[PDB]
Amino acid sequence: ALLGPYQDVQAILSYGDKAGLANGCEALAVSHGMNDSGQFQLDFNDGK
Amino acid sequence: NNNLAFGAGTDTKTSLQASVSFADLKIREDYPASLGKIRRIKQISVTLPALLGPYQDVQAILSYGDKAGLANGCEALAVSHGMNDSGQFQLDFNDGK
Amino acid sequence: DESAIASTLVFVRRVGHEQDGNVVTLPPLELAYQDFSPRHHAHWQPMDVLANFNAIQRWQLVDLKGEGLPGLLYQDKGAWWYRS
Prior knowledge:
With 48 residues, chain A is mainly β. Chain A is built from no helices and 2 strands. Chain B: It comes from Photorhabdus luminescens.
């Protein structure tokens, strides 16, 4: 999308079904559109 | 709490204090209440798109003017260069602190 | 007027010849072109207008929006700034 001067993007991605997820793993917040993710920093090896 | 002023310390009389109220920034309003009620700040970074060069420094201190159960020294952050400028020489969100 | 850098047409003259070898000339057309003379013209001008234009910060000289001259584009985190 195109954005204004310093505008952000608010969106919540969530799974609308039953799954063995730990609490909070059911959703991801998008803050910006640049291939964003659920964390502030993505690391596939932090033990979580 | 949304203003500019000179300070009233004994050595801050020449310092400009740029203050804003969190209550008036309307952060909570961005997301539905149902997502959770506890909404807390994790990190603040300062950007100054100034005519401030790579060899020029800016002296500025960001501080919280209120009561909070902060770790000692977490009440303030110093700014040096203004480009996504954090309070640390290295920013690490996973150092245990 | 021939040089390795450029060869330009500088003189056009129409002439004729008589049967006895004499020559008839008309006033020639003379042409002149601009010269490139950095050896005499190298005028240094300080520039205050390009404030903080730093080669090692997020700055570039680009024309935006179809304009013929480049402006100063600064790409910040979250915004672009521009001086046309």
